[PDB]
Design a protein around this ligand. Sequence first.
Ligand SMILES: [Mg+2]
Ligand SMILES: [Mg+2]
Ligand SMILES: [Mg+2]
Ligand SMILES: [Mg+2]
Ligand SMILES: [Mg+2]
Ligand SMILES: [Mg+2]
Ligand SMILES: [Mg+2]
Ligand SMILES: [Mg+2]
Ligand SMILES: [Mg+2]
Ligand SMILES: [Mg+2]
Ligand SMILES: [Mg+2]
Ligand SMILES: [Mg+2]
Ligand SMILES: [Mg+2]
Ligand SMILES: [Mg+2]
Ligand SMILES: [Mg+2]
Ligand SMILES: [Mg+2]
Ligand SMILES: [Mg+2]
Ligand SMILES: [Mg+2]
Ligand SMILES: [Mg+2]
Ligand SMILES: [Mg+2]
Ligand SMILES: [Mg+2]
Ligand SMILES: [Mg+2]
Ligand SMILES: [Mg+2]
Ligand SMILES: [Mg+2]
Ligand SMILES: [Mg+2]
Ligand SMILES: [Mg+2]
Ligand SMILES: [Mg+2]
Ligand SMILES: [Mg+2]
Ligand SMILES: [Mg+2]
Ligand SMILES: [Mg+2]
Ligand SMILES: [Mg+2]
Ligand SMILES: [Mg+2]
Ligand SMILES: [Mg+2]
Ligand SMILES: [Mg+2]
Ligand SMILES: [Mg+2]
Ligand SMILES: [Mg+2]
Ligand SMILES: [Mg+2]
Ligand SMILES: [Mg+2]
Ligand SMILES: [Mg+2]
Ligand SMILES: [Mg+2]
Ligand SMILES: [Mg+2]
Ligand SMILES: [Mg+2]
Ligand SMILES: [Mg+2]
Ligand SMILES: [Mg+2]
Ligand SMILES: [Mg+2]
Ligand SMILES: [Mg+2]
Ligand SMILES: [Mg+2]
Ligand SMILES: [Mg+2]
Ligand SMILES: [Mg+2]
Ligand SMILES: [Mg+2]
Ligand SMILES: [Mg+2]
Ligand SMILES: [Mg+2]
Ligand SMILES: [Mg+2]
Ligand SMILES: [Mg+2]
Ligand SMILES: [Mg+2]
Ligand SMILES: [Mg+2]
Lengths: 144, 116, 203, 63
Amino acid sequence: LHELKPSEGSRKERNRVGRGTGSGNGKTSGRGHKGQKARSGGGVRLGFEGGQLPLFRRIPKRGFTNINRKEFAIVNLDVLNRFEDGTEVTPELLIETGIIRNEKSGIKILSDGNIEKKLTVKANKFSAAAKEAIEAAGGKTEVI
Amino acid sequence: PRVKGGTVTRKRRKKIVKLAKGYYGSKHLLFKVANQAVMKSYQYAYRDRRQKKRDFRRLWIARINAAARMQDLSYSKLMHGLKLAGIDINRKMLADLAVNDIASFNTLADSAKKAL
Amino acid sequence: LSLLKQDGTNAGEITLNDTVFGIEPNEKVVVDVILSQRASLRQGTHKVKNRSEVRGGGRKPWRQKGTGRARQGSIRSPQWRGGGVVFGPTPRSYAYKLPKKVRRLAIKSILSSKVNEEKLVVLEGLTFDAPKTKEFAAFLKNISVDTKALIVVAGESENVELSARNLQGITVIPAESISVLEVAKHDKLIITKAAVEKVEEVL
Amino acid sequence: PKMKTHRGSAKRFKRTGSGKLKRRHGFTSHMFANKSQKQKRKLRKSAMVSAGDFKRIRQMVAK
RNA sequence: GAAAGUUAUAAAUGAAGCGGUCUGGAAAGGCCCGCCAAAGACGGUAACAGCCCGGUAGUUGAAAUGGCUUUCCCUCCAGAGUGGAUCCUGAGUACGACGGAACACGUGAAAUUCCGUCGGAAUCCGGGAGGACCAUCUCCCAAGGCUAAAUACUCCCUAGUGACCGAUAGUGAACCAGUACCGUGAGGGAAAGGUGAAAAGCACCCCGGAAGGGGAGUGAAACAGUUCCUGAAACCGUGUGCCUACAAGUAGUUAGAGCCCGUUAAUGGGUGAUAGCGUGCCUUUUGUAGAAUGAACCGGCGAGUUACGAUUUGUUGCAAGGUUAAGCGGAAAAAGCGGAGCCGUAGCGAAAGCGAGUCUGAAUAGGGCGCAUAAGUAACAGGUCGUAGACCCGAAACCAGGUGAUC
RNA sequence: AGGUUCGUGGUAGGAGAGCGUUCUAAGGGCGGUGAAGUCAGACCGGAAGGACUGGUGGAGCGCUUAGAAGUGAGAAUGCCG
Ligand SMILES: [Mg+2]
Ligand SMILES: [Mg+2]
Ligand SMILES: [Mg+2]
Ligand SMILES: [Mg+2]
Ligand SMILES: [Mg+2]
Ligand SMILES: [Mg+2]
Ligand SMILES: [Mg+2]
Ligand SMILES: [Mg+2]
Ligand SMILES: [Mg+2]
Ligand SMILES: [Mg+2]
Ligand SMILES: [Mg+2]
Ligand SMILES: [Mg+2]
Ligand SMILES: [Mg+2]
Ligand SMILES: [Mg+2]
Ligand SMILES: [Mg+2]
Ligand SMILES: [Mg+2]
Ligand SMILES: [Mg+2]
Ligand SMILES: [Mg+2]
Ligand SMILES: [Mg+2]
Ligand SMILES: [Mg+2]
Ligand SMILES: [Mg+2]
Ligand SMILES: [Mg+2]
Ligand SMILES: [Mg+2]
Ligand SMILES: [Mg+2]
Ligand SMILES: [Mg+2]
Ligand SMILES: [Mg+2]
Ligand SMILES: [Mg+2]
Ligand SMILES: [Mg+2]
Ligand SMILES: [Mg+2]
Ligand SMILES: [Mg+2]
Ligand SMILES: [Mg+2]
Ligand SMILES: [Mg+2]
Ligand SMILES: [Mg+2]
Ligand SMILES: [Mg+2]
Ligand SMILES: [Mg+2]
Ligand SMILES: [Mg+2]
Ligand SMILES: [Mg+2]
Ligand SMILES: [Mg+2]
Ligand SMILES: [Mg+2]
Ligand SMILES: [Mg+2]
Ligand SMILES: [Mg+2]
Ligand SMILES: [Mg+2]
Ligand SMILES: [Mg+2]
Ligand SMILES: [Mg+2]
Ligand SMILES: [Mg+2]
Ligand SMILES: [Mg+2]
Ligand SMILES: [Mg+2]
Ligand SMILES: [Mg+2]
Ligand SMILES: [Mg+2]
Ligand SMILES: [Mg+2]
Ligand SMILES: [Mg+2]
Ligand SMILES: [Mg+2]
Ligand SMILES: [Mg+2]
Ligand SMILES: [Mg+2]
Ligand SMILES: [Mg+2]
Ligand SMILES: [Mg+2]
């Protein structure tokens, strides 16, 4: 406790302005001379342009939001290889193992990767390529 | 915690005021005019460390000129002749020699005169 | 390690878990955790009054123009004698806490560091019939301690807290309260066997 | 307090996969007799926000 | 209305050094020896005390009054089932038009709640809602009333705490302070702490009307003498080493005799006849010695901060994962528990949707955004930004409640 | 650690390394045989600054490594004396 030394580069000393001219941040404290931006509390809004019409006011709005929108929890094929062949992969098993904790609106299997095992996979949705890839290794797919 | 400003201001200002000893009136008593006087003295000393060398060279040259005119020469002729003879004695030594040991000065003047 | 008895005589040997008492200590982690635990202790009860909380003010001292004085707006402005303070201290909290795994690594590191410097004593038991500081001081003399000490005990240790209370370098803790700041604050660590078993099984 | 999203910008910008903003063209309402078919074909597509504008509007649509 | 218990409002008891010696005005300090401790909290005592004093841990104590908890007493008490003729289930009410208000919701495609004014239902084969509305379904039963706990705050009382202030600070107020003083009034609103351990607070003599001194005495100290610890600078004086009455000076600096000294001892100190060079500081400016601004002098005080978000850099832990919030637990601890949530691991499209692709398009075309071409997350520190007075000082004005026709 | 080469005027401004002040924690010290403060000196460091010696003073204060800030004044027709 009389020899404490924190890891180097993790702590730096704060900079203080308005403390003499030998530091470089003396009289005007890094602000320059006589403007709106030199005053206390001064400056303009985040997107202000001095009176020219701002960019967002020049382009149109697009679209609408759907209230019945569905989004799925996504599983690709590579992570599905961590299972012993001949098993039955189910949503609950995927929850327990740790591949998925958030079941947004269902489980969808996509076809990015490679499988080298025969499994029966049960899920809410499959892509066409995922179904073909699973069936090409000798497995079966069922829609819950 | 609170830091009250004691004992540092007086120390710094007293050091400045003591650096101004011997100045006229308020300039050795009061901090605000002593500070200005001390800055001015430092600037003057910086410039006069340059002017001192050239003043001494002027003095040496004038003394050598006076010594050489008694030997029927000028400073310019004498310096050119000493260059022609390979003699590398500078102004300081020549003026010292002129004031103190004029016989050796006359010897060197004869050497320069023969070089011409 | 070599076990020993409350009277100081040898009692055999004990093996300590290598996962807890035999790691390579992480010194930077321990320093971070010490600074965190020490910042968490302070209270933060400090305040000043700014120009709106000082009594009085409101009225303009004199007119804006004509009198030959500087323009002023209140008698409680920051450059007036009894006026308000500009920023100053305010009541706040200093406590922060860094993730759980780093804290476990820190306790393991400090405890292994105690083991490496041969500053750890394992003890078979520690009991006293009645509270008696003279007897505890004699016990502390039998084993060569003579300095600040942290005693760590489990249940069935009787009258150890009371007998060690009036001695000033000594602190007794109940084996679930072991912490980095308390270990780093004492030179020697004295542990009973039951307490070291419980410490091993906690982490 | 947490900072507020500019609601007018969130109605007309769109975040792409690399983290930059996609916008719509702004000469597309009501005067279509006065511009050619090439112009109208090219103005019905989308565009990207330039670097100078992104420096200025970055923080007001941060979420 | 009783009894038992407990608690609050006075208190009692309570271990161990007059230890030797040094300095000193005085020992609690230094050196050398002991002892107590469920007591080494705090304060006092002639200097810094566990063992000198008040006390502290532990253990006890209540006539009287208050509170709280139990037990007794006292007081008050119908609740199940099977039926479905007939009866009841909140009326100027619910609703609607018009004008307003509250709902995050500014009249809007505007549900829901309330107010004023008009109109105005059904009643179990009945009525309301599910964000205009209709049908189906689902859930519910308005127009009567009461209800503890978890939540908000502190004028107070008791016990404490602080990387809070230390007399221009901290309350306006450490002192007979909302006082003195100012104003018709409402109202505004100060300055001002310190003898000594102990008054031992100077018997007596001398000058003087006194004040004030000089001795003598007290004290460790009177150069601590009733604005009294210390006692800086401006400012006012007395004495003296060197210079100065023919000289034109931002007052110094460089060169330099003569005179006078003798140091943190080293190519040392004070003063300077004469010679060269030389138009203060700040602010604001294309440009200031400026006849542009500010400062009489000295001292004290006096201006980029904090909270919560965003982004970037550094550091550390874990890593296709990372991390808990509130809360529980505890000592205003440290663990353990808590996975609800949040960010990342997939994108494209206004959307339905499709997915390593997708959108546009009649298109197996071309093109846009993505993948191939995979590292994130939690915490701390630095820079900058946002919301807050937001680096500090400064208007003329605006609004709300009061006080004034003693001029 | 040593070389070689090229450099080292500067306002607004960017970057870096430090000095000093108050407080906290640990270590280790000083001090009535005289602390802080105050006065005076011809000493030390590249700067901010730091010692040593003597007078006054009469009770507390440095150093090291870390941490946190009411953190440094010559100017505001600044406020108070
Ligand atoms: Mg730091
Ligand atoms: Mg810095
Ligand atoms: Mg002088
Ligand atoms: Mg002079
Ligand atoms: Mg020169
Ligand atoms: Mg306050
Ligand atoms: Mg004002
Ligand atoms: Mg006041
Ligand atoms: Mg602060
Ligand atoms: Mg963790
Ligand atoms: Mg004795
Ligand atoms: Mg004596
Ligand atoms: Mg003693
Ligand atoms: Mg105690
Ligand atoms: Mg005490
Ligand atoms: Mg004693
Ligand atoms: Mg009716
Ligand atoms: Mg409806
Ligand atoms: Mg309606
Ligand atoms: Mg609903
Ligand atoms: Mg319902
Ligand atoms: Mg009610
Ligand atoms: Mg505090
Ligand atoms: Mg004072
Ligand atoms: Mg007194
Ligand atoms: Mg006294
Ligand atoms: Mg008389
Ligand atoms: Mg008298
Ligand atoms: Mg004195
Ligand atoms: Mg005195
Ligand atoms: Mg004096
Ligand atoms: Mg004086
Ligand atoms: Mg004289
Ligand atoms: Mg003449
Ligand atoms: Mg001389
Ligand atoms: Mg003369
Ligand atoms: Mg001008
Ligand atoms: Mg002045
Ligand atoms: Mg400040
Ligand atoms: Mg920086
Ligand atoms: Mg009037
Ligand atoms: Mg640095
Ligand atoms: Mg200093
Ligand atoms: Mg100390
Ligand atoms: Mg001093
Ligand atoms: Mg001095
Ligand atoms: Mg001095
Ligand atoms: Mg004295
Ligand atoms: Mg900090
Ligand atoms: Mg501070
Ligand atoms: Mg301050
Ligand atoms: Mg200054
Ligand atoms: Mg002013
Ligand atoms: Mg003034
Ligand atoms: Mg005064
Ligand atoms: Mg004044």
